[PDB]
């Protein structure tokens, strides 16, 4: 019942894309972490995951109390969204993302 984003160690807050790249360097596919969006706008976040030995940038949109990777937004929290994709591949959004959120980089 604790859906707090601060409570998740895969959430790193105000770190840069370069800091994310440091943490994903030489990591296995399915490695992931979330940081604040570079814009700092509408309470958005940015998911970065490892796929093909490369770092894939995925916006977490936040609008009218909900979250998701594309409209329609159907998740009530960032934690619910990320938890969902621990066990579902992201391939429906893009066939290049046939991967799960397996291995958090933890603060």
């Amino acid at each position: 019942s604790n859906m707090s984003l601060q409570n998740a160690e895969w959430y790193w807050g105000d770190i840069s894309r370069e800091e994310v790249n440091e943490k994903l360097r030489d990591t296995a596919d399915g490695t992931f972490l979330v940081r604040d969006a570079s814009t700092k706008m509408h309470g958005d976040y940015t998911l970065t995951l490892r796929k093909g030995g490369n770092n894939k940038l995925i916006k977490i949109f936040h609008r009218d109390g909900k979250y998701g990777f594309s409209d329609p937004l159907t998740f009530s929290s960032v934690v619910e969204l990320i938890n969902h994709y621990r066990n579902e591949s992201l391939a429906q959004y893009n066939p290049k993302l046939d991967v799960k959120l397996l291995y958090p980089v933890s603060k």
Binding site: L57, I58, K59, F69, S70, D71, Y93, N94, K96, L97
Partner: peptide
Amino acid sequence: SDYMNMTP
């Protein structure tokens, strides 16, 4: 941008 395009 460098972001992934995510199907709606």
